[PDB]
Amino acid sequence: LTITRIETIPMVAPLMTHRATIVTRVHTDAGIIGEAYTGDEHETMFDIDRIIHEELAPTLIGQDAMAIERLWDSGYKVTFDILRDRRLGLVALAAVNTAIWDAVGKALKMPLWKLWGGYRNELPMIAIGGYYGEPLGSIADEMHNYQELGLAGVKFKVGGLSAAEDAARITAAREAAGDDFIICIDANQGYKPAVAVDLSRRIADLNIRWFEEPVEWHNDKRSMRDVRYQGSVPVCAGQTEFSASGCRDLMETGAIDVCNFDSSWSGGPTAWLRTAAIATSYDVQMGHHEEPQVSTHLLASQPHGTIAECFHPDRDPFWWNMITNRPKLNNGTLTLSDRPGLGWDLNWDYIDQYRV
Amino acid sequence: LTITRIETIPMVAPLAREFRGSHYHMTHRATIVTRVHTDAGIIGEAYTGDEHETMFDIDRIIHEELAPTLIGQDAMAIERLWDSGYKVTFDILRDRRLGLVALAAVNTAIWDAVGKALKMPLWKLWGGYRNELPMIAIGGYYGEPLGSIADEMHNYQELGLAGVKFKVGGLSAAEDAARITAAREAAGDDFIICIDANQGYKPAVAVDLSRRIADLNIRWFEEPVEWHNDKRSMRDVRYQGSVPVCAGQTEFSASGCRDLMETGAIDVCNFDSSWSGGPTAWLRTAAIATSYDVQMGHHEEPQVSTHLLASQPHGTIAECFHPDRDPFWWNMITNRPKLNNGTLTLSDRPGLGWDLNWDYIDQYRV
Amino acid sequence: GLTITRIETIPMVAPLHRATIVTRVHTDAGIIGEAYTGDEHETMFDIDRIIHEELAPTLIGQDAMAIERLWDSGYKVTFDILRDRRLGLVALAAVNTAIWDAVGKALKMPLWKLWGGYRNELPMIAIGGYYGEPLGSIADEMHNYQELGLAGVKFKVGGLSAAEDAARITAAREAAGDDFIICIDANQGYKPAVAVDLSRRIADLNIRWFEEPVEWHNDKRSMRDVRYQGSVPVCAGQTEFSASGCRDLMETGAIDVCNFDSSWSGGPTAWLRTAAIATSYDVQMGHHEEPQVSTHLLASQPHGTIAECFHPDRDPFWWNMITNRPKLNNGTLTLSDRPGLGWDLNWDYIDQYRVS
Amino acid sequence: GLTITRIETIPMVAPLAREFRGSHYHMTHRATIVTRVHTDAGIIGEAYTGDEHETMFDIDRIIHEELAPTLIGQDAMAIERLWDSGYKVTFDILRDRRLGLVALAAVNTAIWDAVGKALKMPLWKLWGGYRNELPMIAIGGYYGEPLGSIADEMHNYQELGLAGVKFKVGGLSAAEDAARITAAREAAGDDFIICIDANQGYKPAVAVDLSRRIADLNIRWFEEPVEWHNDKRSMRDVRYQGSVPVCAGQTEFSASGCRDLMETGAIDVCNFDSSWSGGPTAWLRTAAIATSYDVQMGHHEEPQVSTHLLASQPHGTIAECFHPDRDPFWWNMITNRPKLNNGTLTLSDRPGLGWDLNWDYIDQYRVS
Amino acid sequence: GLTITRIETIPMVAPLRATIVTRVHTDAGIIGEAYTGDEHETMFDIDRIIHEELAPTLIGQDAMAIERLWDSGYKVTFDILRDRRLGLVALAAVNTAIWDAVGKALKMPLWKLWGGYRNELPMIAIGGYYGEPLGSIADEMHNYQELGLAGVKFKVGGLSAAEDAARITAAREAAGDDFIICIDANQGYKPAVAVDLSRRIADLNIRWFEEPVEWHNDKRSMRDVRYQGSVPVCAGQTEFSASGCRDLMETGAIDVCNFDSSWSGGPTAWLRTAAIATSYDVQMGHHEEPQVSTHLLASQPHGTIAECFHPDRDPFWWNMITNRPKLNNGTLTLSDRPGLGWDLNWDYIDQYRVS
Ligand code: NA
C-alpha cells in the first residue's frame, strides 16, 4: 500500500479563545486516504507541520504503509533533535502514525478498535470540567448539563486551592450528579504531596474514580506513589510522559493504577499500544488524556481499557462539530461502528472554514 | 549416623469429598510416608503432602534420584545431603514441584531421624522459641459444603480451634465482604479470621474487599491477586488496603520468598516446606524473613509446620484442613496433641514426635 | 532442658595490646559452654559490664537449648541508643557463642556438623601485606606464610595509588606462585574509580576477592560499581551490624562474598541468618578473622569459603589460645568430631594475661 | 582569607534533676563541648554541640589531635576544602564512627559561625534565607512522668510559649501508648503540635496498630517507629499501612544514609542531626537531597544550630528543645536566646549563629 | 538586605549563536550580571518570561534570600502548555545574576562562596565534529594543544563502533597521552553499539563517555553501557531537575553528572544536584557555560573539568569577557574578584544586541 503523498491542514477555531489541530492525510496508490486529526498544539502548530513535511514525508513517500514498525522506526529519528522540545517530533510522528493506521484499517476493512485487539466496542465517556471560575456555570449546573448531554461522568479540575476548599468543590459535584456518575479529579500537577494526601483522605467516601496528576512535576513518580499509598483514591498519570519507557517508570515505581499516556503527544497508536502491553504486565489499567477521535478505538481494543474523555462543546469544538457521524451517547456510553479505520466522516465545511 | 535404607509407602485415603467445581465432587487423597533407616536403631519418618495425581513420579524421583545420594551417607550432615540432592530440581522438562517435593520428603524424614539421634524434639532443635501455638482450620468453602457460615465457625470453636482461614476470591468485593462479616458475627471477637482468595481477584477488587473488612479485625489476606504479577499487585493490596497480606506458598524457593519480601508484598510468608525442598529450605526463608521483619506462616502440613513455626521467634499460626481434605493429620497420627482453647502444645518427644497409625497405613498403602 | 546456672567471663590482654573475653556458661549438667570472642581493646570492660548486668539476668535459670528464645530476649541490649551499637552486639555474641558450645557438648555434636555439616575441612589464609613492611618485604612475608602451611594471604591495600598497589600485589603473586590464594583488602580506603583502576590492573593475577574496596558512606552502591566495572569479585559484610545490613549489601548487588563477623554482630545465631540469606542471592560466606568460631561456621555451609588468621606476631590468640589447633596440611585445616567448638583452651595463656 | 590561628574547646558537664527514661535508655547528666575557632581577623567562631557524657574526652582529643592540625593556618572561608580534609577522622574502623563525626561537627559549626561573622550574615540567611521565624516544640512525655502528669506537662509547655511536644512512646502496647497520646491531645487541645517518637521501640505491626489508633488526633509525625535493624523498610511499611507521616534520619551517620531512607520511601520528614554527623555542611547536603524527594527537613534537638538550619530551608519544619529540668543548656548557655511567643521564635540579624554565650554558666560547669 | 530594583535583559545574536545578558540592579550600587544559554529560537519567549513572570517576584525583594526567591520563581516551570526548558532557562538567568550580585555584596568570589574547594581546574574544548569543520582530527587536536587546552570532548554517536573507534584512536595518536579525551555521543547509539565502542577504546585512556545512548531508556541503557563497557559514563545535561539527576544516580547510570545550570534553573538547582552527587560518589561536571561552570565546579570537592568551544564555534566565552583567565598548562585559575568576576565587553554587546 504505497504512500504517494502527505497532506496537512492546520486549523484554528474559536470557543483561550481558540483551539488548534492538524488534519493529516496520507494518500496511497490505491486511492485510499488515511485521515485523522491530532493534537491541540497552539503556538507550535506550524513548527509541527514543518517537521511533518520536511523530516517525515521523505521517510514515507513511496513506502509501504502496511509496514508500520518499519516506518515508525525510521520516523522516530525526528525525536532525536536535542536542540528543540522533544514534543514537536513526537506530535509530528503521532500525526503521521495515526493517519497511516487509518489507511491501514481501511485497506484491511477493519475498524481500528478491532484491528488493535477488539476487546469490546463500547465504553463510557466523561467530560473534562470543573474549571475554576465557573465558565460553564456553577458546579451543580455543570454537572447537570453533562448529564443532559448523556455523558457518564466528569474529570473535575482541582489543584488550585487548599485541600479543604477543593474537597468542598468535589463534594458539591458528587451532591449534584448523585451516585450514578463517574467522578475523576485532576490536579494538573498542582499539589505538594501532603496536600494531595490530605485531599485524597477527605474525599474517601465520595467514590472518586481516580486522582490524576496529583503532585508537582519534578519528583512526580515517587511523590504520586506516596499519594497512592498514604491517600485513599487510585492515581492516574502518564499524559506527561514522552515515551513508553517513561510510562514503564511510572508503573515500576508503583506510582499509578491507571496510565493516561497521550498517543497524540507521544508518537501515536504504535507508541500507545506498547504502553498498553506494558500496563498489562503491571496490572495497570489504560486510560487516555482526551483525543476521543483516537482514544475510543485505542481503549476499546484493550481488556484493561477504561473510559474515553472529551470536552464540553463550548470548550472543544473539534469533537462535537468536525465529526459528522459521532455516535450518540446512550446512558453514558459510546458504541463504535464497524466502519474501517477510525471510521469518521469529517465535516469538510468546518475544515474549509477554519484552516489557516 | 549412617543411612542404610530408604523406604517409601505410597498411600491413598478413602474416597473423600472435594471442595471445588460448583458441584459435588469426590477424590482420593494421597501421601508418601518416607522412612530413613540408619545403622543405629533410628528410623526417621515423615509423610508429605497430598499429591494423588503425581505421587508415583515423585516416589520414583526419591528412589532413582535421591536415594543414591543418601544410602551410606551421614544423615547428620544435612547441608551436604541437601546440596547433593538439590540437583533433582534442575530438570527443565518436568514440573519443578516433582523434584522439590521428593527433596522435602527425604529432607523431613532425615530431620526426624537426626532429632531422634540427639533426643531433641524438632521444635527445639530448630530454635526452641516456644512449644505451643494457635491452630486454625481452612474452611468457608463456596457452596456451604460444611454448613452455613455460622455453623461452620461454631464447629471449629467447639473443636478447640483458634480460628479459620476462610475462602474468598470467587465473588464481588461486596458479596465476599458480607460472607466474612457473617463469619465474624457468628464467631465473636476472640477467633482468628484469615481470608484466602487463592489468587482470585484483580487488585482493585481485592483492595475494595480489604477496605470493606477494615473493622472486622481480619488477621491476614492470603494470595489476594492473580498469579502473573502477584508480587507487585499484592504489594498494592497491602498498601492501598487495610489488611496484612500473606503469600509464599506458590514460591518454589527461598529466593522466590526473598523476592516477595523485597517487593514489599507481604506481612506473612506461608512458604510450604513440603512442596519446596523441606525444612532446610523453609528455615532459610525464615531467616530471610527476620531480616525483613516479615512473619512466618506455613500453608497446612501441620505434621511439620507445628514444629517449624513454634521454633521461630516470628512464627505465627498452624493450619489444618477438614478431615475430608486431610485425613492424614486426623487419622494417621495417634498422639496428636489435644487442642486446648485454640492452642496446640508440643511434647518433648524427639524428632517430630509422632506415632503413626500402622493400621491406617497398612489399610491404605500401595 | 540444659539450665544455665551462671555466667563467667575472663577479660584478657596480651601484647603483640590485643584484647579478648573468655566467656563460660555453666549448666546443671556440669557442662560448661566456653568461647573467646573479639579484640575490642578499649571497650572490653563496657562489654563485660553489659554481659553481667544486662544479659546474665535474662539467662540464669533458663534453658540454654532454647537458643532462639534467649537470643530474642538478649537482643534488647542492642536497643540502647546512647552507646555504640557494637557494645551490645559484641556482648550478645559472647554469650551466644558460649551457649552454642554448651549445646554442642550437651548433644555431643561438633558445631561444624550441628550447624549443617557441609564439610569438615577448609583452607586458611593469613591477613597480612601491611604497609611499612613490619613483617618484612613482600617476598619474605609470602614465603613465611607458605612455611607455616597457610593456603594464602589477605593482602592489605587501600593506601596508595592503583599503580603502586597493583605492583605490590604483583610482587606477592610472583613470590608466592599461582597455587596460593591472594585476596586483597582496602579497609574502605579507595575512591571507587581508584578501586576500579586497581581491579583492572590485577585482572590476570587470579585475585580471589577484593574486600571493602571503597569509602564507608556510600559503600554498598560504590562497591557494586567496583564489582561490575572492575574485574575481581567483591567481599564485604564485616562492617554491617545485622543480617539486615548484609541483605542490603546483597540486594544492592554489592558483593560476591559476605564476610560478616559473628563476634562483632550477635554471634552464630546472627551469622547463620546471614548465611541463609546469602544462599538466596548465590553469595558465598566468608568471615572476618575469628578462626576459633569461623572455622565451624564456614565449614557447616555449602557456600562457605575460607577461614582467616593473622601472622603469629600480629595476633597471638589463634596461635596460643588453642592447644589442640589442627595442623595445617596443604593449606587446609580439618576439624575433629569433638563436641561444641572442640577446643582445648590454653589456660597458661589465659591465667597469665587475664585482668580486672 | 580568614586564617585560623587557634582551636579551643571547653568540655562541660551539668547534673540533671531526675533521671529521664525513654524506651530502653535513660539520662542523668547533660554534657557538651564549647568550640572556639580563633582567627587572625579577631573574629571567634563559637558553638556548643552535642551531648556525649561518656565519650566527651575522647571527642575532645580527636578535635585537638586529629582536626586542629588540618585547620590551623588555613582559610576558614574554604569550607569544602576544610571539611574534605577533616572527614578522614571518620575513617577509623576501630572506633565508633560517631566519635569522628561529632568532632567534625564541632569544628564545622564553629567555623560556620566565624564565616557568618566575617561576612556580616546570620547563618539562617547565609544558608538560604527562606524565613527567620519557626515553631519550636519540646521533647517530652517521658515514661515515669518525671516532669509531671501528662496534662501538667502539656500545660506547662503551653505556658512556656512552645508550639507543641514530641511525645515519647515505643515502650508499651499500641492500646496503652494510644491512651497516653490521647491524653496529651485532650490536655493541650487542638492548637498544639503533637509529634510522637518511639525511639525505634516497636515491631512494625505494633507501630501500624498505634498509627491507626491515633489517626484522629491530628498527629504531626511518627518518629523512629520501629526496631533498628530493618528500620528503612519497616518504617516505609508503617508509613503506607498506618495513618501518620513518618520521620527518621537522626540515627544515620551520613547524607548517604538519609538518601537511603528517602529512596526506600521510609520517611516524610528527615530529622538528621548535624551535630552528630559532621555539622552543617553534612546537614545541608541532606537538605538538598530531601528537596529532590519532596521530603521535609527536621532536626533532632540542638536548637542552637537547628534554628538557623531549618529556617534557611524552604522545606524546613520545626525546631526542638527540652524542658529546662531535662536540658539546662539551651536555657542557660545563651544570654540572648530569642523569646518563645505563641509557639514560635524569630531569629535576629546578628551575624553567625548570633549567640551571646553565658560565660558565667560555662565556668560553673567546665571540666578537665 | 540587598534589595532588587530592576531586572534588565539584553538579548544577543552573534555570528554564526545566541544568548541573554541579565542584569539585576540593587538599591546598593551593585549590579549582578551574567550571560546564560544558547537558545536562538525561543530567546524572546524566554526574555518575556523573565520580565513578565519572574521580575514581579523579584522587584523589591532581598537578593540575599536566595531560597525564598528561587522558591517563588520556580512556578514559571509549572506551565503544562510549554516546553519546561523555557521557564527553567528564564529561572537560571535571574538566579545566576542574583548570585553574582550576592557575591559582589559579600565581596566573595563565587567559587569560594559556593564552597571554595579550589580555584583552579582543567578546561577542555568541545570538538571533533563530523565533517571536520575545524580541520582533520590531527590538526584540530594540535590546535587545542596550541591554545593551551587540557583536552577535548570529542563527538561520536554518528557512525559504527569500529568507525568512531578509529576516529577516537586518531585523536589519541595525534594528541599523545598527556591530553584529556572525553567522547560524546549526544544520545546517538543503541546500547550494544556503545558497549562495542567502549570496549574498543579501553586502551586509549578515555576520561568519560557522555550520553552514549538513545533518549527513551537512557538511564537503564547507559547503566548497562557503564557496566558492560570499559569507560566511565557521564550524563545529566538532558535532565530538567536535580530529581532527574538523582534518578540517573540511583539507577547507577553515571560516574559523572554534567547537569547544566543554565538550562535547569541556575546555580541553586545545580548545587542541589552537586550535593546529591556527593552521596552517590558521583563526580560533577557541567555542559559548557564556562562563564558559570568554572565557579560551580571549582567550589566542589568532586568537581572535574570545565568546557568551552573552539573560538570559531563560540564567540561568547572568547569575546564577551575581557578579563578571561589565561589557560596555563591546561588549567584556568580563577581570581578573587567578587561574584563571577567578569568584565563584559560592552562594545561586543552593543554590536550584537537585538530586539
Ligand atoms: Na490531566
Ligand code: NA
Ligand atoms: Na495506605
Ligand code: NA
Ligand atoms: Na492459601
Ligand code: NA
Ligand atoms: Na577486611
Ligand code: NA
Ligand atoms: Na528522636
Ligand code: NA
Ligand atoms: Na554532551
